[PDB]
Coordinates of C-alpha atoms in Angstrom, one line a residue:
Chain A
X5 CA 82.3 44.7 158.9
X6 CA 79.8 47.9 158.1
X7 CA 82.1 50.0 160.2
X8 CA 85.3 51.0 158.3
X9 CA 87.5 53.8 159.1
X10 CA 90.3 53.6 157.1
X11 CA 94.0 55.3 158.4
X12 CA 95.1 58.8 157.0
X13 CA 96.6 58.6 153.3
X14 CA 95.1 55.4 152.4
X15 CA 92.0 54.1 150.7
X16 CA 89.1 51.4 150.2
X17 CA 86.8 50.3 147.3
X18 CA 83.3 49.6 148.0
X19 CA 81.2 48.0 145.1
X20 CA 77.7 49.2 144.5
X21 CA 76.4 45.9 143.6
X22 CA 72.9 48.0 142.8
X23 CA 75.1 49.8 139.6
X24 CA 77.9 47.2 139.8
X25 CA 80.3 50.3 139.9
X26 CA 83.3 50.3 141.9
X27 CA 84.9 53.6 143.8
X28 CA 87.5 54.8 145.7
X29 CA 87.8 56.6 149.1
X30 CA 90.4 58.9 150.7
X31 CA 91.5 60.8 153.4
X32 CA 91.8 60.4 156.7
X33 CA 88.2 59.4 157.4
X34 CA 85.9 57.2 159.3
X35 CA 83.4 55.0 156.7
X36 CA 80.0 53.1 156.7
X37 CA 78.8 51.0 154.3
X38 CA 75.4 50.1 152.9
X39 CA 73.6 47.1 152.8
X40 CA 74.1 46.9 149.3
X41 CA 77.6 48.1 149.2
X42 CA 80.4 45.8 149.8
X43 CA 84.0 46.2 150.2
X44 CA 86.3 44.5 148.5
X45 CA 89.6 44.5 150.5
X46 CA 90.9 46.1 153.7
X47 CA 92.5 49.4 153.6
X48 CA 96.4 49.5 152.2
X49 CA 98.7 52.6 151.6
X50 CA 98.0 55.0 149.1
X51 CA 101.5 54.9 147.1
X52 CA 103.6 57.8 146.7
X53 CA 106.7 58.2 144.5
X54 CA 109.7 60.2 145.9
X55 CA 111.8 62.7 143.8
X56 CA 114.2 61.1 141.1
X57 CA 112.0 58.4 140.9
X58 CA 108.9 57.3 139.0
X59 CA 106.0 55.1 138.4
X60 CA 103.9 53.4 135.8
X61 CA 100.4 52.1 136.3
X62 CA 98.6 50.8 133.7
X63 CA 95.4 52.1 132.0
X64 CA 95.6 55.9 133.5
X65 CA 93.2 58.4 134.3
X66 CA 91.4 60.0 131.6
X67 CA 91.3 64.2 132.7
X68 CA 90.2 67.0 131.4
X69 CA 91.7 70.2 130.8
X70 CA 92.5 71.1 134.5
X71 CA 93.2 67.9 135.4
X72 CA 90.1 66.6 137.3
X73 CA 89.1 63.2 136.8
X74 CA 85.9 62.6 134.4
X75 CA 83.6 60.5 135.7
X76 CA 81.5 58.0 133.7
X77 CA 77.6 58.2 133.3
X78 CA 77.2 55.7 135.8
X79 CA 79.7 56.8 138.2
X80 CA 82.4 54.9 136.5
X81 CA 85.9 56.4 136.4
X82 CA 87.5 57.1 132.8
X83 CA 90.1 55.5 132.0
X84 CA 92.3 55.3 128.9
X85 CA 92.7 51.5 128.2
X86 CA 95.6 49.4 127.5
X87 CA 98.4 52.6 127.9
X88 CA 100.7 53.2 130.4
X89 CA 101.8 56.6 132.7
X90 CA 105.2 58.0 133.8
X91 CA 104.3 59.6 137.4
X92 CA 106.9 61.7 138.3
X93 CA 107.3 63.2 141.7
X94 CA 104.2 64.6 143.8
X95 CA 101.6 64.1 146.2
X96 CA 100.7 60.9 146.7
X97 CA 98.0 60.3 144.7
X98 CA 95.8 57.1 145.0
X99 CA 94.7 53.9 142.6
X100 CA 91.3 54.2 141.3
X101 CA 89.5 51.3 140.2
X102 CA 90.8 48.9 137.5
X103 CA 94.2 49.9 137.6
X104 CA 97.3 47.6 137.5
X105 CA 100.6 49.0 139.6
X106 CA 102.7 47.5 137.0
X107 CA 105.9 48.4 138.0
X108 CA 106.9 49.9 141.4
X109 CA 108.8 52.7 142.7
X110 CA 111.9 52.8 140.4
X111 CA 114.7 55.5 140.6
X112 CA 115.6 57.9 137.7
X113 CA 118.6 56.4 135.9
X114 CA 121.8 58.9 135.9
X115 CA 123.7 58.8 132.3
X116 CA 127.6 58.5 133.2
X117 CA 129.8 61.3 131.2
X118 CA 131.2 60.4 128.1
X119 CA 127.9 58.1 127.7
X120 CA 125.2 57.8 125.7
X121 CA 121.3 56.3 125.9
X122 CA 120.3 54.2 123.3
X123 CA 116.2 54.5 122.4
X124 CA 113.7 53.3 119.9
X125 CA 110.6 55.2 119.3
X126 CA 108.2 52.3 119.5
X127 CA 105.1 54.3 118.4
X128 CA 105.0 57.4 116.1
X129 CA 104.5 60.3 118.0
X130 CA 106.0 64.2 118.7
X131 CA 109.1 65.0 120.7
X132 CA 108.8 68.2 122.4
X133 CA 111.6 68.9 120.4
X134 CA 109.1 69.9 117.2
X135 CA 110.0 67.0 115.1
X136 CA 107.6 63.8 114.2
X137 CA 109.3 60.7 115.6
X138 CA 107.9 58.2 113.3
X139 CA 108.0 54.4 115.1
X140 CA 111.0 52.1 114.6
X141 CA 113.5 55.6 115.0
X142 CA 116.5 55.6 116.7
X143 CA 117.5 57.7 119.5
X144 CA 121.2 58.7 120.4
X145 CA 120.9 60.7 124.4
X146 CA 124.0 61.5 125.6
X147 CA 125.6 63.7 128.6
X148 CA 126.4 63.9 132.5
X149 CA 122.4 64.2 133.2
X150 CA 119.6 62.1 134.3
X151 CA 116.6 60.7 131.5
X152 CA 113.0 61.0 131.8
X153 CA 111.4 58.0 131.1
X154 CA 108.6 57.5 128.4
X155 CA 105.7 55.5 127.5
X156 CA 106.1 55.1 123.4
X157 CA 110.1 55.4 123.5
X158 CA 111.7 52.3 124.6
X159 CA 115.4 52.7 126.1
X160 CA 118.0 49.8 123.8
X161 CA 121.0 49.4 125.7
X162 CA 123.7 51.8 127.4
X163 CA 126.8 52.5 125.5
X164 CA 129.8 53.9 126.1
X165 CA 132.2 56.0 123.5
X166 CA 135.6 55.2 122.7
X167 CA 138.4 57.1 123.7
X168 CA 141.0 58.0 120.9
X169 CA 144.3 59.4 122.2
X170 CA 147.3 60.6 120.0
X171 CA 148.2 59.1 116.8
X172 CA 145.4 57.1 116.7
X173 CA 142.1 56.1 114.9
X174 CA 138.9 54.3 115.0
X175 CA 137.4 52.0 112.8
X176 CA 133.5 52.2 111.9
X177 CA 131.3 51.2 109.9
X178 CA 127.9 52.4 108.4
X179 CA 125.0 50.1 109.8
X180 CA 122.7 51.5 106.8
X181 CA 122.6 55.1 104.7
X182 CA 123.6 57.7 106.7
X183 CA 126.4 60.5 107.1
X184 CA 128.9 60.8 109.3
X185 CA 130.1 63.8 112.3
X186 CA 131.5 65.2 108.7
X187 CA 129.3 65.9 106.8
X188 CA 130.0 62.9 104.3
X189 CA 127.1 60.2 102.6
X190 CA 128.2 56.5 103.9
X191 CA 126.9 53.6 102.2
X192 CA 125.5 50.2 104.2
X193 CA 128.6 48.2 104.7
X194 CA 131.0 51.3 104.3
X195 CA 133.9 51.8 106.3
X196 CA 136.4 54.7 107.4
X197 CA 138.3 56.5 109.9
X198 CA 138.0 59.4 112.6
X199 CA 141.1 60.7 113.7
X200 CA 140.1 63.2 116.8
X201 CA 142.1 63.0 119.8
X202 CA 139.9 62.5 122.9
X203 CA 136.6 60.6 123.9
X204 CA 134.5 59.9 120.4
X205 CA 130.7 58.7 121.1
X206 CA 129.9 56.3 118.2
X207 CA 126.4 57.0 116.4
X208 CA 123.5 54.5 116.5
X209 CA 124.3 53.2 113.0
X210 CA 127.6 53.3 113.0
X211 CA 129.4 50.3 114.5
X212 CA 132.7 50.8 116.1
X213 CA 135.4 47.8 115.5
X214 CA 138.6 48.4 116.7
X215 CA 141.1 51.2 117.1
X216 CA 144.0 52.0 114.8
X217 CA 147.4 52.8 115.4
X218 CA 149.8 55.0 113.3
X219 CA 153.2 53.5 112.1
X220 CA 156.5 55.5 113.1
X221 CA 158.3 55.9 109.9
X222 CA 162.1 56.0 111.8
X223 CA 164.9 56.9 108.7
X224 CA 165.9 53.3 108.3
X225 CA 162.4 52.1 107.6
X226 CA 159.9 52.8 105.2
X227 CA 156.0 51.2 104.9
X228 CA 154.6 49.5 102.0
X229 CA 151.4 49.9 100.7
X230 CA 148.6 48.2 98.2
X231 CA 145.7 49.9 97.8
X232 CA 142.6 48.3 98.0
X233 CA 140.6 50.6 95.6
X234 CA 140.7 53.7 93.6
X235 CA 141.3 56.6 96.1
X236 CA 143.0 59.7 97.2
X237 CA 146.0 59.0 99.6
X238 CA 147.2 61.9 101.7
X239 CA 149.4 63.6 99.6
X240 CA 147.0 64.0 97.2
X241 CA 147.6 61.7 94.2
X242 CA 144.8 59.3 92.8
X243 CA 145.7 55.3 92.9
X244 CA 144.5 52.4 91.2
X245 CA 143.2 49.1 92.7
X246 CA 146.1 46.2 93.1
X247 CA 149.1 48.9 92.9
X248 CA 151.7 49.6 95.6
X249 CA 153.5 52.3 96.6
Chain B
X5 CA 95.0 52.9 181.0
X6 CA 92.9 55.7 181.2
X7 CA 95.1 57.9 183.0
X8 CA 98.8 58.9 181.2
X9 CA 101.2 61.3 182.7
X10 CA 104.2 61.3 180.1
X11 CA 107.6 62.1 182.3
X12 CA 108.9 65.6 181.5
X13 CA 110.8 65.6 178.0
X14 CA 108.6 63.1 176.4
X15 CA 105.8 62.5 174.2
X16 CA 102.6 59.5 173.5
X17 CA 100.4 59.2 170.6
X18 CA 96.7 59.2 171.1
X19 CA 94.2 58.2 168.2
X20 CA 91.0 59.9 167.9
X21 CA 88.7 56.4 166.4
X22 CA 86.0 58.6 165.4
X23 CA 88.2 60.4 163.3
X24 CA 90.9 58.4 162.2
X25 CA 93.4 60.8 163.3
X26 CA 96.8 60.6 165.5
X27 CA 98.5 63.4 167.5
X28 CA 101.2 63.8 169.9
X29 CA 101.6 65.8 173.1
X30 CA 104.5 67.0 174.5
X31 CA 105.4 68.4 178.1
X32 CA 105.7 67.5 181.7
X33 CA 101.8 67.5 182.0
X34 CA 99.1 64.3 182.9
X35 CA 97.1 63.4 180.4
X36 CA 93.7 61.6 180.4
X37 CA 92.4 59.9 177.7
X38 CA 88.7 59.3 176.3
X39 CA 86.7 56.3 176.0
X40 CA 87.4 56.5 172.0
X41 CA 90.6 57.9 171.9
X42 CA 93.4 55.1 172.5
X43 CA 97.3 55.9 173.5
X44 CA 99.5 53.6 170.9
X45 CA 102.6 53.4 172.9
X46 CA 104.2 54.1 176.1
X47 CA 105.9 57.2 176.4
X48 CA 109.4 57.3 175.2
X49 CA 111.5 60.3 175.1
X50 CA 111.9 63.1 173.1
X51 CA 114.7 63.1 170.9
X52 CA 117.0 66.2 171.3
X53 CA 120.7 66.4 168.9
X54 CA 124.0 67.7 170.9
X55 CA 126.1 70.4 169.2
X56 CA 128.2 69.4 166.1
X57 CA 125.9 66.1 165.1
X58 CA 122.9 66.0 163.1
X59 CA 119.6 63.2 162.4
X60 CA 117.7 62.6 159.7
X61 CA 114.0 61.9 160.0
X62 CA 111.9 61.0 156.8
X63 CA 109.0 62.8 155.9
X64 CA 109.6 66.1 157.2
X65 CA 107.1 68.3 159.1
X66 CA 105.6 71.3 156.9
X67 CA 105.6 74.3 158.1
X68 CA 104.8 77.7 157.3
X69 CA 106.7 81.1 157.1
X70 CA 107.6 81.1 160.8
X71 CA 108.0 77.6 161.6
X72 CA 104.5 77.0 162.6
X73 CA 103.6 72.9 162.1
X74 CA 100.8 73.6 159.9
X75 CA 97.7 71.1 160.3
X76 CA 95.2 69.5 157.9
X77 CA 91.8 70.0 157.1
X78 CA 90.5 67.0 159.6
X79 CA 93.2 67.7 162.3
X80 CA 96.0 65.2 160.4
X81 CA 99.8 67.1 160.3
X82 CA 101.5 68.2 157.1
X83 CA 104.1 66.6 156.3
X84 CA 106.2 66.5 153.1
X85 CA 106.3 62.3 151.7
X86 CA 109.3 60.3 150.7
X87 CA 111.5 63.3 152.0
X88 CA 114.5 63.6 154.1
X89 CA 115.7 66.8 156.7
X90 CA 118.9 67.4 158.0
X91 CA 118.4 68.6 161.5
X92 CA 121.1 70.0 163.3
X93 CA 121.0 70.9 167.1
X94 CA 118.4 72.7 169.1
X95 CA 116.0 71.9 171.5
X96 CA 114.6 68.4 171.8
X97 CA 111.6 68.2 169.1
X98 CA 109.3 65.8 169.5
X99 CA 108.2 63.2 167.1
X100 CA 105.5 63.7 164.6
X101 CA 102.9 60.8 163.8
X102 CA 103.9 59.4 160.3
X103 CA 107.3 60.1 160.9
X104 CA 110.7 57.1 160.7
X105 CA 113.8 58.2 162.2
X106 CA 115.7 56.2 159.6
X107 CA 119.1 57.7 160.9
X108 CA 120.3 57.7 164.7
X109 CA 122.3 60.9 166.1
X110 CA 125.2 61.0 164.1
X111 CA 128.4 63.6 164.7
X112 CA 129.3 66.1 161.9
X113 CA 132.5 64.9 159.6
X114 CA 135.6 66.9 160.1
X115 CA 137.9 67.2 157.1
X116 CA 141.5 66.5 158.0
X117 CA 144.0 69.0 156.4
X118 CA 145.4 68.3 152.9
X119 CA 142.0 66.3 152.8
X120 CA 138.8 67.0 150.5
X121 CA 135.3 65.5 150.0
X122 CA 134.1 64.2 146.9
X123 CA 130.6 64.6 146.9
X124 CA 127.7 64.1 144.0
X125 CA 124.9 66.3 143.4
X126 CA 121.5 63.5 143.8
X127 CA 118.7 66.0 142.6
X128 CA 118.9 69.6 140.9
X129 CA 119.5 72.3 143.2
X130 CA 120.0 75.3 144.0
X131 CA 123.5 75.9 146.1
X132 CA 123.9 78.8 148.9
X133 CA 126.8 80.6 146.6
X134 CA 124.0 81.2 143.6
X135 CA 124.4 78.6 141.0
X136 CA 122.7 76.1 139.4
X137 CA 123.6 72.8 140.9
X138 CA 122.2 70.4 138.1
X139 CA 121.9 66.5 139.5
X140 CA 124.8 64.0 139.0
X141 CA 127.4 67.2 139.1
X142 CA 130.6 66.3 141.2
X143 CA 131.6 68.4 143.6
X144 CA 135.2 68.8 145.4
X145 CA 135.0 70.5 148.5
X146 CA 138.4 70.4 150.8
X147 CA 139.8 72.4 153.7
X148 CA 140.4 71.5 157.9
X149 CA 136.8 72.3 158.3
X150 CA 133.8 70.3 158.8
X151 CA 131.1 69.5 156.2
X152 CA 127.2 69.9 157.4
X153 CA 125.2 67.2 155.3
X154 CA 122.6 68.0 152.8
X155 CA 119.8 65.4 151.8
X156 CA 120.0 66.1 147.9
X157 CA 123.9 66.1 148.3
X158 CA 125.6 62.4 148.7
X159 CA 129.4 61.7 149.6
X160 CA 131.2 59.6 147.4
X161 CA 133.9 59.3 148.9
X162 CA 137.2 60.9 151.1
X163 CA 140.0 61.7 148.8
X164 CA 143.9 62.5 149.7
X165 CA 146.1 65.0 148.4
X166 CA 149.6 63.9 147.1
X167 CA 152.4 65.2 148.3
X168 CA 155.3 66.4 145.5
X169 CA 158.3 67.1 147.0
X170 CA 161.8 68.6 145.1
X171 CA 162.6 67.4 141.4
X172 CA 159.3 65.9 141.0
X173 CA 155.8 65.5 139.2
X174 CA 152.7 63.6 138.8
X175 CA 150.6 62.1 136.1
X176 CA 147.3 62.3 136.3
X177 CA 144.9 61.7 133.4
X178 CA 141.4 63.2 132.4
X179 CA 138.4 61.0 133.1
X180 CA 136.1 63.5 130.9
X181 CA 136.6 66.7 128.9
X182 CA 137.8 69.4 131.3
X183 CA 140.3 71.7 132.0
X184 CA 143.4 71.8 134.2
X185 CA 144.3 74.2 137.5
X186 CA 146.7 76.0 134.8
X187 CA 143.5 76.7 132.4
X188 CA 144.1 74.1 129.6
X189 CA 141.6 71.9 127.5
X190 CA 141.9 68.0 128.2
X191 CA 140.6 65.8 126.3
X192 CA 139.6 62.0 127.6
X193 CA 142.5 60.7 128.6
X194 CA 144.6 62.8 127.8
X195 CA 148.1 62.9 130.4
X196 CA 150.2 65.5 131.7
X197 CA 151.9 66.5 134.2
X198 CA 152.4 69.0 137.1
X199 CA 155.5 70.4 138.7
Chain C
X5 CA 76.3 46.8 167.8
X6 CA 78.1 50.0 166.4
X7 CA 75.2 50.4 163.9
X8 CA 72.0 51.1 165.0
X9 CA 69.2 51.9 162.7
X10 CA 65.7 52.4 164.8
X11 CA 62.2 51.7 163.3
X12 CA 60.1 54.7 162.1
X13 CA 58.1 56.4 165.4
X14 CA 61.0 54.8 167.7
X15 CA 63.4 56.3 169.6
X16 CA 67.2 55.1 171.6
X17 CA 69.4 56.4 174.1
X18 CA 72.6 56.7 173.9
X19 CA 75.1 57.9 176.6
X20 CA 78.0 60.5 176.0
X21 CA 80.4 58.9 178.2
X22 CA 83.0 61.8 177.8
X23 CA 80.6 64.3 179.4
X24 CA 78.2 61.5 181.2
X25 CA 75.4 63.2 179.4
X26 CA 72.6 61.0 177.8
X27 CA 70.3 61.8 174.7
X28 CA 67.2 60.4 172.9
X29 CA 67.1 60.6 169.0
X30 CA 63.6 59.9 167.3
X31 CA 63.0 59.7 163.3
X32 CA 63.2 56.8 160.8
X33 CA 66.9 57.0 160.7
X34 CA 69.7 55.3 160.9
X35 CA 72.0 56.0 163.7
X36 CA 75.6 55.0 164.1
X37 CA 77.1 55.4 167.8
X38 CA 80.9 56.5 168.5
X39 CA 83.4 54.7 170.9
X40 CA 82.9 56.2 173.8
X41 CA 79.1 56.3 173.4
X42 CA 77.2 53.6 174.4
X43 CA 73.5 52.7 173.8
X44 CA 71.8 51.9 176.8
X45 CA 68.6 49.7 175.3
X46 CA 67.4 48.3 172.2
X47 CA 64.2 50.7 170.4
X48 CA 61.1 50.7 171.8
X49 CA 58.3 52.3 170.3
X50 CA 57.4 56.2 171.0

């Protein structure tokens, strides 16, 4: 029981029931306790986390400027409470005292092309970007690549855009006040079309309904229309609500 | 149990208790242990790769500038965690402690002709030709030759070419934004054809 | 039996079995013997 040599890359914690302050031990090294000093479990791996994969334990180390862990007047370890830690890739570090492994070893998740990552900012913080993400934003990530993960920035769902081939358009409507890829103010409730050929990625407020289909006009046919408000059709010439054309 | 000659071409792991500490020794020589020290395992033997097949062993030994196993502080071995090496063949290495040969000896892939490999770039890269192999990248690599694995590069799968014979063509569509062999924007699926 | 603290003005030995060497260690300290060393008797006063 005194006599506790622990295996290389793993770690113990021994309570000093004289301070009632728990620590950690590493390395591959052979330990003896005190009299006073009791262990509180047998030795188990030190966890690493490979590359494209990551971590989160809960109440991380509290470090200063080069990274080395501050240590309490008592010999406690800082810690930052209640907050979580993305560990990316490195050595395999080990868990100090009062630290929950949350959630294991999880792989980076790869964004398919022509898709998008939908995310909330759940606390107000700074992207390295430069801008202030105030909480409750809404994140649009899209491409071929892989996303970091993030403590304050909670992924939504996965979404996929909407392929629009010749003579063809998509329906979509504004979610709340916003502008659209043109450049044009859209009211809650508001709807209108995109007419570009190819893979279109709808926005995070804008929801996409269905697809719409142009009419041949052959010689021998012709298509009635009613508008449905005062506009500006195509060729340029104003209408009034109710007439037909 | 005190005295352990390992066979020639073969190895045993000893662990030093007053240190914590495992080793390996390699060679047609006897071997005596101490009174601390204890031998895990019988000797089994050393694993050596023939020509045109490779293994993979996780963890991977670190070594220095020439090769050199470097060695820690308190006698442990360097090794690199949650990594995987391609090693193809030489002369028959021995085992290092801490190390899972996850995959058995396992022959090189040859590429049939009118044949290519569709492989997928895991992790960022750097590529021997000198460019910037960002992860999740596809790759299309074709040819009668064989393809030497890589641990950041993953095979999705084998793909066949068509044959077009006389007064013919094929449709094929675009699955992203791209451009064709004749040096033409695509859009998503957009369709053409080639003659 | 690994640990092996002897009184104050006491004294142990303990044998080297790898070289077959033995050794006596005096002071109020606490002594901790290896694997391959073994104590041969229990302290008795200097």
């Amino acid at each position: 029981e005194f006599i506790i040599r622990i295996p290389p890359y793993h770690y113990i914690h021994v309570l000093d029931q004289n301070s009632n302050v728990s620590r950690v031990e590493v390395g591959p090294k052979t330990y003896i306790r005190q009299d006073n000093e009791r262990v509180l479990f047998a030795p188990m791996r030190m966890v690493t986390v490979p590359p494209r994969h990551y971590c989160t334990v809960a109440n991380p180390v509290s470090r200063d400027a080069q990274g080395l862990v501050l240590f309490d007047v008592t010999g406690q370890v800082r810690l930052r409470h209640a907050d979580l830690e993305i560990r990316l890739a490195q050595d395999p570090f080990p868990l100090y005292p009062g630290e929950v492994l949350e959630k294991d070893i999880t792989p980076l998740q790869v964004v398919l092309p022509n898709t998008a990552l939908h995310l909330k900012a759940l606390l107000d913080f700074e992207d390295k970007d430069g801008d202030k993400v105030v909480a409750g934003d809404e994140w649009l990530f899209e491409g071929p690549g892989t996303y970091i993960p993030r403590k304050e920035v909670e992924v939504v769902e996965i979404i996929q855009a909407t392929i629009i081939r010749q003579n063809q358009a998509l329906r979509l409507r504004a979610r709340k006040e916003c502008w659209d890829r043109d450049g044009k103010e859209r009211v809650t409730g508001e709807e209108w079309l995109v007419t570009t050929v190819g893979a279109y990625l709808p926005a995070v407020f804008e929801e996409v309904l269905d697809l719409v289909d142009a009419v041949i006009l052959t010689e021998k046919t012709a298509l009635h229309l009613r508008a449905r408000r005062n506009f500006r059709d195509f060729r340029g010439v104003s209408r009034r609500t109710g007439e037909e054309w």
